[PDB]
Design a protein around this ligand. Sequence first.
Ligand SMILES: N[C@@H](CCC(=O)O)C(=O)O
Length: 484
Amino acid sequence: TVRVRLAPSPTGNLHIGTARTAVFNWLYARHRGGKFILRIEDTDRERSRPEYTENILEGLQWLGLTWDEGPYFQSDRLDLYRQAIQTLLDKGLAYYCYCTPEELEALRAEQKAKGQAPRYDNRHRHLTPEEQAAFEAAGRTPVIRFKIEDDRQIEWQDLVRGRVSWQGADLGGDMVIARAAPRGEIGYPLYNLVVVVDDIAMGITDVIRGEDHIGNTPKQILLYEALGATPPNFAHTPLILNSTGQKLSKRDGVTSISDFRAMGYLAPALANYMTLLGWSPPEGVGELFTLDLAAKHFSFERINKAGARFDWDKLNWLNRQYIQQLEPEEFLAELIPLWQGAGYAFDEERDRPWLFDLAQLLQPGLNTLREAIDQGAVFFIPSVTFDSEAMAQLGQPQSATILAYLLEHLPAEPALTVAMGQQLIQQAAKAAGVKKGATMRTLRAALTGAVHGPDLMAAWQILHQRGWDEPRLAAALKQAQTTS
Ligand SMILES: N[C@@H](CCC(=O)O)C(=O)O
């Protein structure tokens, strides 16, 4: 049974990168009929707080990225890391390093000057009780380093990358596995230690990771061996790239799942999208798929082996498709607080029939749910200001005649049929001596303040239910007349 896991640190909100990894995990586990484990790497850090854990779970659930196990919290497991490290010290596979950061910096500078590989020189591997005690009496307290063999050939068959090969000397020397603490105490366990201890304990069969952390892989492989475990398979995916081709920056633009959600993007659209960022679907599947369908066909072979540029136009293309999948009643419900938030005056209960009609109208051409604000303005703001084209349209010689006909022949009854509407345009045109196009264009100007926009008959139907076509036609007629 395949076992995979998401291991986010709640140091910030759920970002697209992490969620993308979660998608690949959920997709791979589901494909292989395995388990998806969620592990929260909650650290003593200033950054780690319960509001980011909250945001992580919320976003995963919302994206439909259901875990089968957890969340298992790192902070409950502290002693397991302590045990693992103590086992390493006892075995002499780890040791106390008393080398200060100022000492490391001088080493590193002396390395650059000499054209030597940048690394810790393993200077404290074999310290004498006397040497340790000298450091301690000067008030030093040691970190704990895990021994890495310089000449060790580390290799793995990566599920995305292929054979990946590292020398032991390429890992930067004996790595710190625990932060400073006095001898007899063990400090805060570092990432590479924690992840192997937990991956071994959680029985993880396959680790899915961003390629930006590929260098931890040979380090972790050595920890598994030292702890007597066989490492799992690794799959290193390329990161999501910019709109142009550099790193997607957390400090530049929108990356968090909660922000995309806030913007009017739907969960299934986000899911479908993140998948498309790196995974190209097989012939016959297409670009519009659920997670359940993506699971039937998911494989690491088909992962685009370089960065997927993030494209707003494609996210929008998908979101439009999901918005259209929304039931008219659910869809309207999504819109109401949006319109409410804009300060638009209406009553959910009283104004329902045309509100619904407005939803029906606006649905087919929204890229985000937020687009219903500006696209609804003409139906919620009473007065219309005429644009440069509307003003020139009403300035046409027969505009007054058209409008006055329309105004005089509007039905009192609340529902305007498409039949009654076409009758009116046809008859207003006949009165003015003009073609239907110019008539509609004059009606458009009157009702919207523009010469182009949403389906006119439907816009008029909506505005008629409000009783708003009547004062608008009157305002346009008065406008036509001021030119005359
Ligand atoms: N947070 C990193 C490393 C955690 C891990 O999967 O071990 C990533 O997923 O790219």
